[PDB]
Amino acid sequence: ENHGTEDELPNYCFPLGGVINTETLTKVKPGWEKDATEFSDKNEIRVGNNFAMEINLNANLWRNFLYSNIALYLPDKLKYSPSNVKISDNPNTYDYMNKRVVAPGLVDCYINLGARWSLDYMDNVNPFNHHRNAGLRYRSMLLGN
Amino acid sequence: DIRGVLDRGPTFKPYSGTAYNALAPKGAPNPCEWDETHVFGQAPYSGINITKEGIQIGVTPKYADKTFQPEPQIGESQWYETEINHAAGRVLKKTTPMKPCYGSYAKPTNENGGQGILVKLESQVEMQFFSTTELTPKVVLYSEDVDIETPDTHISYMPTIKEGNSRELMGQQSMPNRPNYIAFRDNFIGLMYYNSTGNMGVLAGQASQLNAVVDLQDRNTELSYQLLLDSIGDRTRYFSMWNQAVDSYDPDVRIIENHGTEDELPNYCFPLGGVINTETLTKVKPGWEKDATEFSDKNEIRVGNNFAMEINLNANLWRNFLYSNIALYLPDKLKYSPSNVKISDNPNTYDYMNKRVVAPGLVDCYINLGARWSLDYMDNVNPFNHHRNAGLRYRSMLLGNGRYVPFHIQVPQKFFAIKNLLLLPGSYTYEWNFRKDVNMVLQSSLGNDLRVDGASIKFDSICLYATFFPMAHNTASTLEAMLRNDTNDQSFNDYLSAANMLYPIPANATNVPISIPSRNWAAFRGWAFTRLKTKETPSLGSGYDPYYTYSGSIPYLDGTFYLNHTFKKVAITFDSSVSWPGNDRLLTPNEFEIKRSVDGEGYNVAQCNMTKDWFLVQMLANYNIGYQGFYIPESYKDRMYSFFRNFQPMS
Amino acid sequence: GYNVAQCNMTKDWFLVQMLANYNIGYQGFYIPESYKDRMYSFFRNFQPMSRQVVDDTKYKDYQQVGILHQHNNSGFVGYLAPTMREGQAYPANFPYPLIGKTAVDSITQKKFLCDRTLWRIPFSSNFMSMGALTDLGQNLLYANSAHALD
Amino acid sequence: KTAVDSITQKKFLCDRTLWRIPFSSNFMSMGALTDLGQNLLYANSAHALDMTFEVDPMDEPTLLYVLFEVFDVVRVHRPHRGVIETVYLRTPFSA
Amino acid sequence: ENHGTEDELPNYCFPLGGVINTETLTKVKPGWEKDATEFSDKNEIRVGNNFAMEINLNANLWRNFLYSNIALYLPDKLKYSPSNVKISDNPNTYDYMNKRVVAPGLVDCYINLGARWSLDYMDNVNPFNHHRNAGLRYRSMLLGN
Amino acid sequence: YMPTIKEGNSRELMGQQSMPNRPNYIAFRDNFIGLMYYNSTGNMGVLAGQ
C-alpha cells in the first residue's frame, strides 16, 4: 500500500561540539583600542549558523523495508550474477541464491506510487517462503538459535 | 465520592526523554565564559553597522534592544556563506552554572522573551566587542546571566571534582531522568480498609446498632474482586469512572523476539548545499587557449562523488529500544555507582535508582540473537513495574501531567457481603475507614519509597451517592413484604472463597515444609498457591506499617503474579503417613513434579522442562481438557488470568 | 460536586446516556457487552481527558510570552517555518515546567470528546428502553389533547 | 560453517496465574462441592496435613502464598423495618 | 498521547572510510634512528577518536509525525500567507490551502508533554477530513492512482 | 522559501527550498452516498405498475 512517506520537515546531524569551524578574535574597547589584563587573544567565536548535514528518514526507512522484503524475492530471471566472485552453479544451493545481486531500481520508493497493487512478478511465486512468515519464524525459534 | 488535593512530589515525571532542547547533541555546551579568562561562543545574527551603542538593526539608525535582542532564533537563510561583516550574539557570564545545552532551561523575565536577571529592577547585560587579529569591531556579544536549571536531566559523565567553571568542565554530558508514572491503584485498591479488625467497617440498623459486617484476618477481598471482574467481563477495555485499567506489560520487553534488523541498504546523510569541497577552474577553448568576456575565472566545479556519511538506522533504533526498556531495569547488583557525583545512600530513593549507571554491553543488539528467550535476570523482577505498563500509564494520564493535582474520584464497594445487597425501607448507619499512607494508596512505576520523596495527599470532602429505581409504590410494598420472609433470605458467596496463609521462606533456602494441625476437611475444594516477595507485601491487618517502603505494584492485592516459574516439587500427605493422591495416579507415585532438568527429559512435554503429568493436571483443572486429546480451548474459556493464555515456552 | 468520570460531564446526564443506550445504571455501572456497544454507540466513543496549565494569576514570576519569542531547540530548527536550521544554542524559555523540584503552581482543565454519536433523550418515565412504543407515548394525557413544545 | 559445539537450555514463564491442584479424584471440575469433599472418610474424622515445597532459591526473603479454597457463604435476613441481621459460615477453617 | 521519546543513547554517523583526517608519519627504531628498506614514509595514522557527529532519531521521528498529521490541519486563522509567492485569493481552492505556511513551534515535540489531551483547536475541525482516514484512503486506491 | 521576488536566474536564487504538496485523496463517498436522488420532491423517484 505504497502511500508515500511523511517527510515535511528536514532532519539534521550536528557536530559533537556543536561547532567545529570557529575563528580566533581579540577583544577591543572604545575609535577603538586593544585590551589586556582581560579575555585572552584566543577566543573561539563562530559566525553564522553551525555546520550541519541533512538526511531524510522516512524515505530511507521505506527504501530499506522494500528492498529487504520484496527486491530480494524476485524471480532469478531478473537478477544477475555478480563479478569477480565465485558462485555455485546449482540454482537450488543457498550459495547461489545468496550471491545473486538485484538492482534496487527495480523496486524503489516510487514504484506504483499511490496505488494498492502487487507487483506483476511477485504474484507467481510462493508468498509463504518469506522470512516474515510468523508461523515459520515461531516454529524455528521453538527449537532454538 | 471523594474530593481532595494531591501532591505527587518531585519524583513524578510522566514522559521519557526531556522537554527542552531535545534535538541538541548531548555534549553541546551553551556559549559561556570562564577564568583560568576565555570565551567560547557563536554569533548567528547579522546586522549593518557596529558602533559603541551596539549592533544596528535598521532605520536615523536604530539599535537592538539589549533586554531581548538579538533573539537567539533569528539567523541566516541561505546555505552558502556570504562573509557576514557585522554579527551579534548572546553569551552567559562567568557567574552562572556550567551546563550543557541539552535540557537547559531558564525562565523568562519580560514579555519580549528575554531571560536576563533583574536587580535594583533593571537588567545588567554588558557589551563585549571582538575584532579580527589585525580598526573597527566585527562581532558584538551580549553577555548576561540567567537562572539556568535542568528540570529533568542529570550529568552522566563529570570529568573532575573541583567545583567552579573551569576548562575541564566543558566535557560534561547529560542524559534524561528515568520516567516514573504515579497514579492511583487499579480499582482504587487500598483506599478502602478491608480485613482489618482495628479498622472494622460497620453497616447496621439505626436502632439495633449491631454490626452486620464481620471480616476475617485471613480473608482476602480485593484479590477476590479482581478475579471476579475478569471472569464476568473483558479487562482489555478501559473504564475511567472506576479507574478500571488492568496492569499489563509489553510482550516484547518480557520476552525478546530478537530476530535482528533489516539493514541491507546503506542510509546516508548529505551536506546542505550538496557539495562543500569544490575547487575553482577557468574556461578554455581550442591546442587550447584561455577565454574572456565570458564565464568568469571563478567557477565552482566538484570532481568525483560528493562528501557524505552513513548511518545504520534499524540497528540504532533496536539499540535504543533495548537499552531504554530492559537495560535500565536490571537488578541493582549488576549496576555500579557513577564517579565524581553524589548519590543517595538509601537504595529505595529515586535519586539512587536514577543515578546508577548500566553498561550497555550487558544487553546490546546481539544478545541471544535469533532466539526467543527472556533474560536470566529479568525473570525474577516484577514486570509490571515498567514504564510501558499501559494500564498504569493510562491511569497516570487521567489525573493530569502536573505534580499538584486536585482530584475528584468515585470509589465502589468491594465487600462481597454487601456489594450486591438489596436493602429495604428503613434507616441504617453506614460507616467505614480510609487509608492515608501514600505508599499504599498510590502506585509508582519504579517502586521507590514515596514517604521519603515528599508525596502527600489530603482529603477535603466525602459524600455518598445512591440511585433508586423509580418503581411503582403499590408493587414496591408487595415486593418488600415478600422479601421479608425467612424463606426468601438473600445469600451471597465470595468469588475466590479461600483462606489465605502466608509462610516465610528464608533467602537462598530451597525446601520449605508447612504443617496444619488436625482438623475436619469436609467440603474442602483444593489448593492454589504462588510465591511472593516479602519486600513487596504489606503486613496483614496493621493500621500503619512503619517498615513498608515499596510503592510499586502489589501482587498480593491486584493479582499480578510473576514467580510461578520457580517451583520444582510438591509433596502432599495426610497424617504424615499416607500420601495424596496416591494410587499411582501420576508417573511419580509420591509427589507432583512441576519441572525437571535435562536428566528427566523422558517426561518433559511441550518442548519445555515442565513434566507431562503437571501439564495434564493444569489443563484438567482449568478447562477439563486432556482425557480426549489436547487442543487449544475456546477463546471465551481462557480469560486474561487463565493458565493457557500466559504459558510461554522458550529455548 | 456534580461531575463524574473524572471529567466535566454531570452525573445525571451520564446516567441518562447509559440508560438510553444499554439500560445500565440502576444496578451499578460497568462495561457493557462488546456486542451491545457498536461502532456508533455512546460508550465506545467517550473519551475523558484532563491537563494542567500554569496559573498565570498565582505564579509570582509569570510572564506571558508570544509565539514570536519562544525559543526551544534554538539553532537547530528553522524560525517560524519548516526551513533550514538557523540561530544559536541557548537555554530554552518555554514551556513552564510542571514537574520536578522547581515546578510552578498550576490549575486544571477537564473536557471530553464524543464523536459518531447523538445525544439521546428517551421519552419514557425512567429513561429505559422497554419497547419501541414507549409507555409515555401510550399515556392518555398526550393521546387525547394537543400540546405546544418549546 | 564455523559454529561451535553447544548445549541447550529450556524454561518457561507463567504470569498472572496460580498453580491449581483440585481436590478431586480425577482432577476434573464437576461442581463446586467436589466428590472427595463429600467422601465419608473426611466427613466424620479429622486429619493433620503437612506438605513440603521444593523451590529454586533467590537471594532475598520471599513468602509462600497458599490458598485453601473453601465455601464462604453469607445469608442475610431482615424480619422488620430498619433491622438487618446476617449469618456467616466458612467451612472448613471456620473461626 | 504525548509520552515523549526514548532517546537514552546517542546515534552517530561516521565517514565512509571510517577516518578522514589522518597524519603521515615515518617509522623509526631504537636513542632512536630512522628506517629504510621497509614501511614507506607515507603512512596514514589517525590519533584519537574518529570524526563523527550524531542525530536524535526518536525525537526527529516524533516531530515529523506531529507536523505532518496535526500542524497542517490547524484552522486558517492561525496560519499566515507566505512571502514573494503568488497564492489564490479564494480560500476554498487547493492552491490556497497548500501554500499557507504554519510555524512548527505551535505543535512541537513538547506540546502538553506527558498529558493525554487533544488540542484546543482540533476539537472544532472535522477529524474525518484527514489523509489518514483509512476508509477514504482505501476507497481512493480502489479507483486507481 | 523564495529569497527574492525578482525573476531571472540570479545568484540570490540559489537559496530556494521545496517541500511536497499536501496529500489529497479523492474518491466516491461511502456506500455511494449522494449518487441517487433521495428526499427531493423535484427529483422524485418512481416505481409503478406498467
Swiss-Prot record, chain B:
Q: Remarks, anything else?
A: All late proteins expressed from the major late promoter are produced by alternative splicing and alternative polyadenylation of the same gene giving rise to non-overlapping ORFs. A leader sequence is present in the N-terminus of all these mRNAs and is recognized by the viral shutoff protein to provide expression although conventional translation via ribosome scanning from the cap has been shut off in the host cell.
Where in the cell?
Virion; Host nucleus
Q: Which family does it belong to?
A: Belongs to the adenoviridae hexon protein family.
Q: Write the span of the intact protein that is present.
A: 102 to 802 of 952
Subunit structure as annotated in this protein's UniProt entry: Homotrimer. Interacts with the capsid vertex protein; this interaction binds the peripentonal hexons to the neighboring penton base. Interacts with the hexon-linking protein; this interaction tethers the hexons surrounding the penton to those situated in the central plate of the facet. Interacts with the hexon-interlacing protein; this interaction lashes the hexons together. Interacts with host dyneins DYNC1LI1 and DYNC1I2; this interaction might be involved in intracellular microtubule-dependent transport of incoming viral capsid.
- What is the source species? Human adenovirus C serotype 5 (HAdV-5)
Protein name listed in UniProt: Hexon protein
| This protein's GO CC annotations | host cell; host cell nucleus; T=25 icosahedral viral capsid; viral capsid
Q: What does this protein do?
A: Major capsid protein that self-associates to form 240 hexon trimers, each in the shape of a hexagon, building most of the pseudo T=25 capsid. Assembled into trimeric units with the help of the chaperone shutoff protein. Transported by pre-protein VI to the nucleus where it associates with other structural proteins to form an empty capsid. Might be involved, through its interaction with host dyneins, in the intracellular microtubule-dependent transport of incoming viral capsid to the nucleus.
The site annotation (Involved in interaction with pre-protein VI) covers: G626
Q: GO MF terms on file? A: structural molecule activity
Keyword check for Phosphoprotein, yes or no. yes
Supply the alphabetized keyword list: Acetylation, Capsid protein, Cytoplasmic inwards viral transport, Host nucleus, Host-virus interaction, Late protein, Microtubular inwards viral transport, Phosphoprotein, T=25 icosahedral capsid protein, Virion, Virus entry into host cell
Q: Which residues carry this modification: Phosphoserine?
A: S46
Q: Does the keyword Acetylation apply?
A: yes
Induction is noted as: Expressed in the late phase of the viral replicative cycle.
The principal location of this protein is virion
Q: Which GO terms describe its biological process?
A: microtubule-dependent intracellular transport of viral material towards nucleus; symbiont entry into host cell
